[PDB]
Design an enzyme around this catalytic site. Structure first.
Site, PDB file in Angstrom:
ATOM      1  CG  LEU A  46      -1.776  -0.922   1.437  1.00 19.34           C
ATOM      2  CD1 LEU A  46      -2.485  -0.968   2.256  1.00 19.34           C
ATOM      3  CD2 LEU A  46      -3.203  -0.756   0.419  1.00 19.34           C
TER       4      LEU A  46
ATOM      5  NE  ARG B  93      10.007   4.124   1.462  1.00 16.07           N
ATOM      6  CZ  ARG B  93      11.102   5.161   2.192  1.00 16.07           C
ATOM      7  NH1 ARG B  93      11.368   5.010   3.110  1.00 16.07           N
ATOM      8  NH2 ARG B  93      11.392   5.800   1.625  1.00 16.07           N
TER       9      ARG B  93
ATOM     10  CE1 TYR C 174      10.961   7.072  13.193  1.00 16.28           C
ATOM     11  CE2 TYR C 174       8.475   7.828  13.495  1.00 16.28           C
ATOM     12  CZ  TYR C 174      10.020   8.364  13.312  1.00 16.28           C
ATOM     13  OH  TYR C 174      10.633   9.540  13.878  1.00 16.28           O
ATOM     14  CB  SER C 175       6.149   1.031   9.572  1.00 17.76           C
ATOM     15  OG  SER C 175       5.416   1.628   9.144  1.00 17.76           O
ATOM     16  CD  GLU C 176       9.804  -1.003   3.380  1.00 15.33           C
ATOM     17  OE1 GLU C 176       8.809  -2.286   2.309  1.00 15.33           O
ATOM     18  OE2 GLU C 176      10.792  -0.376   2.778  1.00 15.33           O
ATOM     19  CB  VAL C 177       1.530   0.130   4.920  1.00 12.41           C
ATOM     20  CG1 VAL C 177      -0.075  -0.601   5.340  1.00 12.41           C
ATOM     21  CG2 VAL C 177       1.859   1.032   6.079  1.00 12.41           C
TER      22      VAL C 177
ATOM     23  CE  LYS D 274       3.124   1.436  12.345  1.00 13.30           C
ATOM     24  NZ  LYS D 274       2.153   2.952  12.350  1.00 13.30           N
TER      25      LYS D 274
ATOM     26  CG  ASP E 282       1.159  12.499  12.927  1.00 16.74           C
ATOM     27  OD1 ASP E 282       1.335  13.922  12.600  1.00 16.74           O
ATOM     28  OD2 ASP E 282       2.333  11.953  12.321  1.00 16.74           O
TER      29      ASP E 282
HETATM   30  C1  0XG Z   1      -1.529   2.906   4.579  1.00 21.23           C
HETATM   31  O1  0XG Z   1      -2.093   3.534   5.642  1.00 21.23           O
HETATM   32  C2  0XG Z   1      -3.536   2.223   5.726  1.00 21.23           C
HETATM   33  N1  0XG Z   1      -4.041   2.217   4.375  1.00 21.23           N
HETATM   34  C3  0XG Z   1      -5.264   1.654   4.268  1.00 21.23           C
HETATM   35  N2  0XG Z   1      -6.145   1.140   3.333  1.00 21.23           N
HETATM   36  C4  0XG Z   1      -5.833   1.906   1.639  1.00 21.23           C
HETATM   37  C5  0XG Z   1      -5.004   3.084   1.710  1.00 21.23           C
HETATM   38  C6  0XG Z   1      -4.136   2.748  -0.027  1.00 21.23           C
HETATM   39  C7  0XG Z   1      -5.397   2.626  -1.001  1.00 21.23           C
HETATM   40  C8  0XG Z   1      -5.134   2.985  -2.386  1.00 21.23           C
HETATM   41  O2  0XG Z   1      -5.255   4.023  -2.255  1.00 21.23           O
HETATM   42  N3  0XG Z   1      -4.536   2.248  -2.617  1.00 21.23           N
HETATM   43  C9  0XG Z   1      -5.160   1.113  -4.059  1.00 21.23           C
HETATM   44  C10 0XG Z   1      -2.888   2.182  -2.960  1.00 21.23           C
HETATM   45  C11 0XG Z   1      -6.371   2.197  -0.344  1.00 21.23           C
HETATM   46  C12 0XG Z   1      -6.917   1.409   0.997  1.00 21.23           C
HETATM   47  N4  0XG Z   1      -5.979   1.139   5.373  1.00 21.23           N
HETATM   48  C13 0XG Z   1      -5.186   1.656   7.004  1.00 21.23           C
HETATM   49  C14 0XG Z   1      -4.576   1.487   6.854  1.00 21.23           C
HETATM   50  C15 0XG Z   1      -3.639   2.022   7.999  1.00 21.23           C
HETATM   51  C16 0XG Z   1      -2.327   2.804   8.485  1.00 21.23           C
HETATM   52  C17 0XG Z   1      -2.391   2.109   9.834  1.00 21.23           C
HETATM   53  C18 0XG Z   1      -1.034   2.721  10.912  1.00 21.23           C
HETATM   54  O3  0XG Z   1      -0.164   3.518  10.075  1.00 21.23           O
HETATM   55  O4  0XG Z   1      -1.273   2.808  11.799  1.00 21.23           O
HETATM   56  C19 0XG Z   1      -2.905   1.417  10.643  1.00 21.23           C
HETATM   57  S1  0XG Z   1      -3.976   0.997   9.252  1.00 21.23           S
END
Ligand code: 0XG
Ligand code: CL
Length: 327
Positions: A44, A46, A49-52, A67, A155
């Site tokens: 998804l 980065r 401090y992490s890569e999601v 994460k 934040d």
């Molecule tokens: C990236 O972060 C997330 N993203 C998402 N969904 C999505 C993010 C992006 C798309 C998109 O547009 N595409 C297609 C790349 C689709 C779904 N859902 C939960 C988190 C969390 C972050 C964290 C955290 O930092 O604690 C806990 S859940």
């Protein structure tokens, strides 16, 4: 001598009346499960401090976000985990589904609920007057809850508000900078992201509280109702205060620092200059008029204040005439 001390107007002694196991995150024992249950489908994003990654749970085949953490001091990892567990189940708080490690690599990861997000730069332009009111109220529920639970997010920004617009579902995410509120505590002012930092952080007033999140929310609201993203656009933390001062005015800034006996940086003397207070109507124009109203401006006005004590609390904000059409 030093700065005048401050206390939160709400939820002041909330951690004080609870046992240390609640807020003493350093003594928290983290148990790392098996990551095998989660297979990574695609990346998804980065963080710093992490890569999601998007992932699927082989147990029940439910969608998930993993994460995978970079090496960080275990104190901050314990803090984020403890806050996530304390706030789990709360309104609009992202659910920590699991805490896991890859068997071979040993790399720790946090597993979260998935939110089918729409990118905020695409989404925010589509939002109606009612949408902005609706989603702001969903954020306020998350904040009033976490504040009542003795925690500052620290934040708040569009990147940390996941919205599934189709299902009208909002989740406040990334609690990595979040912290427990203890009245009297002088905190690190290097938190939040530049454009959403409250004046308290920028003038280095350490004894801040939950009201820092309400400033940041005000920055988001200003950007949404006026269609100016970000609203305050400074080139650094010093210049960020200049951008604020050019809207709120320098007179109330210097009254604020005088009230709290804040030791201002010499660099600020040169760069702040003198600026009058600019009325909120000056930001209304043909393309954002439909998102603006007397109640919207009055609401924004009571969020974007230098004096953190004078800002609406989350509960107060939820009772503002702006939300009479939602609730
Ligand atoms: C990236 O972060 C997330 N993203 C998402 N969904 C999505 C993010 C992006 C798309 C998109 O547009 N595409 C297609 C790349 C689709 C779904 N859902 C939960 C988190 C969390 C972050 C964290 C955290 O930092 O604690 C806990 S859940
Ligand atoms: Cl910190």
């Amino acid at each position: 001598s030093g700065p005048v001390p401050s206390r939160a107007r709400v939820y002041t002694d909330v951690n004080t009346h609870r046992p240390r196991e609640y807020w003493d995150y350093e003594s928290h024992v983290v148990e790392w499960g098996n990551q095998d249950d989660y297979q990574l489908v695609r990346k998804l994003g980065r963080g710093k401090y992490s890569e999601v990654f998007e992932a699927i749970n082989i147990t029940n085949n439910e969608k998930v976000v993993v994460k995978i953490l970079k090496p960080v001091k275990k104190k901050k990892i314990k803090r984020e985990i403890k806050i996530l567990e304390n706030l789990r189940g709360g309104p609009n708080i992202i659910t920590l589904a699991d805490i896991v490690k890859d068997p071979v690599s040993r790399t720790p990861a946090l597993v979260f609920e998935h939110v089918n997000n729409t990118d905020f730069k695409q989404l925010y332009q589509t939002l109606t007057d009612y949408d902005i009111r609706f989603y702001m109220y969903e954020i306020l529920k998350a904040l009033d809850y976490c504040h009542s639970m003795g925690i500052m997010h620290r934040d708040v920004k569009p990147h940390n508000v996941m919205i599934d617009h189709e299902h009208r579902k909002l989740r406040l995410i990334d609690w990595g900078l979040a912290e427990f509120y203890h009245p009297g505590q002088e905190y690190n002012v290097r938190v939040a992201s530049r454009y959403f930092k409250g004046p308290e952080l920028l003038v280095d007033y350490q004894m801040y509280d939950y009201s820092l999140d309400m400033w940041s929310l005000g920055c988001m609201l200003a950007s949404m109702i006026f269609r100016k993203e970000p609203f305050f656009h400074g080139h650094d933390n010093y210049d960020q205060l200049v951008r604020i001062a050019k809207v709120l005015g320098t007179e109330d800034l210097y009254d604020y620092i005088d009230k709290y006996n804040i030791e201002l940086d010499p660099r600020f003397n040169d760069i702040l200059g003198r600026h009058s207070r600019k009325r909120w109507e000056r930001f209304v124009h043909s393309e954002n008029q439909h998102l603006v109203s007397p109640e919207a401006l009055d609401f924004l006005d009571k969020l974007l204040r230098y004096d953190h004590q004078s800002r609406l609390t989350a509960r107060e904000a939820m009772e503002h005439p702006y939300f009479y059409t939602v609730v």
